[PDB]
Design a protein around this nucleic acid. Sequence first.
DNA 1: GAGGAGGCTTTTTTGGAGGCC
DNA 2: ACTCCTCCGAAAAAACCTCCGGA
Lengths: 133, 132
Amino acid sequence: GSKVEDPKDFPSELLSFLSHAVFSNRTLACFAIYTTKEKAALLYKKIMEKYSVTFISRHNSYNHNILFFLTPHRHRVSAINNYAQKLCTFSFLICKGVNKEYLMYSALTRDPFSVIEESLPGGLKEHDFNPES
Amino acid sequence: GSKVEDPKDFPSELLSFLSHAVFSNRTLACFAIYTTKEKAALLYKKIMEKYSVTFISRHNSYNHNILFFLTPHRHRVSAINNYAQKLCTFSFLICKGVNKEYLMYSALTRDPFSVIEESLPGGLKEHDFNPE
DNA sequence: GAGGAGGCTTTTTTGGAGGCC
DNA sequence: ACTCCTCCGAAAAAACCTCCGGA
Ligand SMILES: [Ca+2]
Ligand SMILES: [Ca+2]
């Protein structure tokens, strides 16, 4: 059952990068979703369409997957979560706002994580999280 | 006079990394100071002692300097500012909490910025802002 | 949900052109 | 030897009010 089998949070390696105030009124434009591989593969396209994302990437996380995305306008975390939870009503799903957007994405590119697919060829680099010059 | 001559904020390249809510009750453990070179050189040591910093670095920023530091316990920005402003009562000084600690320090190491001195040999790397 | 920022809304300034619709 | 009609739309200024949210 879920209490025994499901993760209750993101992997510990990533927690310092996230907002844990999942009910906050402070809107954001960078989010992460932790879920099953089956679900993450479907959600990748759905998120991309629903939120007209500037950028999305899907990452391996041992048996499971993580989505990382950036939106053109800001949203409450509870809004993103509600959309994601209602699409598929089986299995776990953890949704959190990302405070350290570069560090998050960058860690998701390296052991124990890796990129499965992303919406821009070559992905992102530290430069892209600096102001445009 | 100050209104004509002094910077009123950090350089624009760095603003997205900082908290602008300088009067906030929110405590933090990463701060930056923008001031003159002669003030920054003295403050480097004073900060290090007053706040028992885990790390501090002084950076060139065109004619002026920026201090970047990390503290072992959290403080209000106003507390750090109040200490810094009262030490030397001449010239400008801008103090702000840092939201994007790695991006801030990393940008302070590259053109147009550079490291003048720092409290650990070799400084910091992205690995250091990940969990141990 | 304070209080500042910035934007929608409204008023004031402005000046080209009217003359029995 | 030197300051006057009016109407109405556009544009500029000012006022106010919504938005985000102790970031
Ligand atoms: Ca001073
Ligand atoms: Ca709040």
